[PDB]
Amino acid sequence: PQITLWQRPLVTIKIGGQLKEALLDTGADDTVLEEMNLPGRWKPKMIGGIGGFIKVRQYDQILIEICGHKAIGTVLVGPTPVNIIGRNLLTQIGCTLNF
Amino acid sequence: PQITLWQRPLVTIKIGGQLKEALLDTGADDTVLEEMNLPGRWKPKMIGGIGGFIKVRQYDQILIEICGHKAIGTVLVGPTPVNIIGRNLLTQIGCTLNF
Numbered sequence: 001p002q003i004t005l006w007q008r009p010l011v012t013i014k015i016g017g018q019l020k021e022a023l024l025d026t027g028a029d030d031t032v033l034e035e036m037n038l039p040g041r042w043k044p045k046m047i048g049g050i051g052g053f054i055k056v057r058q059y060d061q062i063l064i065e066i067c068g069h070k071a072i073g074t075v076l077v078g079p080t081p082v083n084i085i086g087r088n089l090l091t092q093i094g095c096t097l098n099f
Numbered sequence: 100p101q102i103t104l105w106q107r108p109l110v111t112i113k114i115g116g117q118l119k120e121a122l123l124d125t126g127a128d129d130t131v132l133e134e135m136n137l138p139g140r141w142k143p144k145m146i147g148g149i150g151g152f153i154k155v156r157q158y159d160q161i162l163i164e165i166c167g168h169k170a171i172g173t174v175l176v177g178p179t180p181v182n183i184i185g186r187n188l189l190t191q192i193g194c195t196l197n198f
């Protein structure tokens with residue numbers, strides 16, 4: 001599909017059987033979701049954006065479904081204000097920026 | 100032009116006769132640039148990101164060239180980690196997300 005940017009580019013994602021809303025963020029290197037439970041072991045990590053840094057938990061090889069497209073990659077979980085789908089997963093679904 | 104996301108979507112922008120590098124960010128509602136000098140009066144604004152809020156200066160009707168495409172709009176200036184081209188200007192150059 002082609003997403004215009006008059007409004008925030010929010011889409012529905014499926015992860016861990018749960019359905020959620022998330023923002024397609026080309027400015028985010030990684031993907032970070034609000035506090036939730038995921039399987040496997042995790043690694044602590046600090047990520048910084050506008051405003052400073054936050055502590056998140058890193059999970060690897062997590063399967064996410066974005067608008068029907070399956071994608072695999074690292075998923076961070078932490079006190080983020082909104083769910084964010086970063087570049088690490090946007091590339092997997094063939095997402096691009098077009099002027 | 101089509102831009103993949105395997106790397107940060109960095110482009111060159113021209114503002115105040117100067118060349119700068121900035122990030123095309125669909126996750127940013129507004130455009131914020133690192134500390135610099137702009138003409139006219141400014142208004143105060145608070146923007147919230149991943150790690151909290153920051154205070155920025157708001158300038159209106161600023162001319163800015165993004166990859167050869169001229170745009171005129173609101174530009175914010177403050178302690179941002181990188182120069183950011185947000186949705187307010189991305190829509191002016193007809194930028195869309197595609198997959």
Ligand SMILES: O=C(N[C@H]1c2ccccc2C[C@H]1O)[C@H](OCc1ccccc1)[C@H](O)[C@@H](O)[C@@H](OCc1ccccc1)C(=O)N[C@H]1c2ccccc2C[C@H]1O
Binds near residue numbers: 025
């Ligand atoms: O933090 C970032 N990346 C980092 C990131 C994110 C997730 C995981 C890892 C990493 C590392 C780094 O790439 C990106 O910034 C550039 C950036 C790049 C590199 C280093 C630092 C910053 C994001 O795309 C932010 O732009 C955007 O974040 C999503 C968000 C939307 C709405 C509300 C709260 C948060 C955000 O903060 N948006 C707000 C904003 C921004 C500018 C002007 C106005 C407004 C209002 C609101 O829309």
